[PDB]
Amino acid sequence: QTREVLDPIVASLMEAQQIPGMAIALVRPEGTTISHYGAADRETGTPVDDDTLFEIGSLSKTLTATLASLAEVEGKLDFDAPVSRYLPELEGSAFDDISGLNLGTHTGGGLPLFVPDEVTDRASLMAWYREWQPTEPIGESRTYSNLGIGLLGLETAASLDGEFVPTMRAKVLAPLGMQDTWYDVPEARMADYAMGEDKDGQPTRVSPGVLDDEAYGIKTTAADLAKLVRANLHLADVDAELQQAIDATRQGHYRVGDMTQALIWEQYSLPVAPETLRAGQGYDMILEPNAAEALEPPQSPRDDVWVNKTGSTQGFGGYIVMLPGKHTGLVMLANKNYPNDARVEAAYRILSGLGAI
Ligand SMILES: [Cl-]
Ligand SMILES: [Sr+2]
């Protein structure tokens, strides 16, 4: 059925890219199909199953954004207000002029991609934030940043008067039914934890780091993410505030060439060519500052769009795609960091083969 469309494309993808294992969820109106492929660990040959946990890396940022947006709904966080307002430890710094909205759309004044080596903890981090000088016009330039989204998650935590991961647990994960979603994988589940594989074919597993939780830290299943995507597509039974919070994450906030930057979710109007999609996942978009223009009639979630998000670690490769107007979504997790082109193409082929595009 679905499986007849899906299975040969994933088989071809897994061969062409030498991916040990994948887990795939297709959300549609009529229900969700979970499919598992290959080995969770290439060495042992243990198959991927219902309980296999994958690093999603940068995909974690959508959870961070969801929780942020939920603090905003509850009236505890204002997205427009300066960050120093909820983190007063940063008064007098650049963050008097940078907002939570800026942080969730990567328009926080050129905040770099990585946490610098010198920053080894929260104190050295806040100190680094205090000193840092912007290198690009705030709100007019997009630079993909772990420092920024992470700061959004500190700010959100602060404003809800709690710590990040337990607050995320109670307010987003648990209500969505995402009990296989872990920031720190418990001892009992380690046998379910997929082993990753880099582009030279080496075993690799993410290491702890500052802001790992807020930026790239989740390990989870395809089904759990299907629950988030399900909510986004309004096919879930969810609390009304959480549902607004989730919907608010899909508001277009800035234009960046062909791409509309929402709250971490990136989107494109239909019809869209795969090349455009590839451009959005490429060096030019990810590793360079790109002019951004704030959307002034600020856009309600659209229903004629490709909404997507990539996630990688050194040994894992994930991608989510949502077509809100067809109530259709795709979660593909892999335990190999395989190129973003292969992701967009496999996605497109899948969704086109199903007739969603
Ligand atoms: Cl980093
Ligand atoms: Sr941490």
Residue 180 is assigned to a ligand binding site = no
CA distances from 203 to 42, 170, 206, 290, 303 (A): 9, 33, 11, 34, 41
- Measured in degrees and rounded to the nearest 5, phi and psi for residue 41 equal -140, 125
Domain range for 158 = 1-357
C-beta separation of 230 from 200 below 8 A: no
Ligand closest in space to the Cα of 144: 1
Per-residue three-class SS string for 198-262: CCCCCEECCCCCCCHHHHCCCEECHHHHHHHHHHHCCCCCCCHHHHHHHHHCCCEEEEECCEEEC
Centre of ligand 2 to C-alpha 262, Å, is: 26
Residue 80 is assigned to a ligand binding site = yes
Centre of ligand 2 to C-alpha 83, Å, is: 20
Please provide the distance, in angstroms rounded to a whole number, between the alpha carbons at the two ends of the chain. Answer: 17
> In sequence order, what are the residues at sequence separation of 6 or more whose Cβ sits closer than 8 angstroms to the Cβ of residue 292?
105, 107, 139, 140, 141, 142, 254, 255, 256, 261
- 37, 86, 129, 144: which is the annotated catalytic residue? 144
Distance CA 292, CA 101 (A): 13
CA dihedral 53, 55, 61, 62 (to 10 degrees): -40
Give the CATH number of the domain where residue 184 resides. 3.40.710.10
Task: Write the DSSP assignment of 284-344 as a string of letters.
Answer: HHHSS-EE-EEEEEEEPPPSSEEEEEEEE-SS-EEEEEEEGGGTEEEEEEESS---HHHHH
Centre of ligand 1 to C-alpha 40, Å, is: 25
The structural domain count of the chain equals 1
Angle CA 156–160–162, to nearest 5: 95
C-beta separation of 49 from 31 below 8 A: no
Identify the experimental approach. X-ray
Provide the resolution (angstroms).
Answer: 2.8
Query: For strand 290-291 and strand 266-269, is the pairing parallel, antiparallel, or unpaired?
Result: unpaired
Exposed/middle/buried for residue 288 (C-beta within 10 Å: 0-12, 13-18, 19+)? exposed
CA distances from 86 to 25, 77, 78 (A): 38, 8, 9
Token couple for 52 = 């296999």
Q: Which residue in 247, 210, 203 sits closest to 228, CA to CA?
A: 247
Token couple for 51 = 């309980």
Alpha carbon 309 to its chain's center = 6
Token couple for 250 = 């899909």
Token couple for 296 = 């002034």
Distance CA 314, CA 198 (A): 5
Distance CA 26, CA 28 (A): 6
Q: Which residue in 302, 244, 338 sits closest to 12, CA to CA?
A: 338
Distance CA 351, CA 357 (A): 6
Match 């050129």 to its residue by tokens.
110
* Catalytic residue check, 144: yes
Centre of ligand 2 to C-alpha 249, Å, is: 24
> In sequence order, what are the residues at sequence separation of 6 or more whose Cβ sits closer than 8 angstroms to the Cβ of residue 215?
58, 60, 61, 64, 146, 149, 150, 153
Distance CA 20, CA 65 (A): 30
Distance CA 343, CA 330 (A): 11
Q: Which residue in 275, 230, 215 sits closest to 34, CA to CA?
A: 230
Token couple for 183 = 């920031």
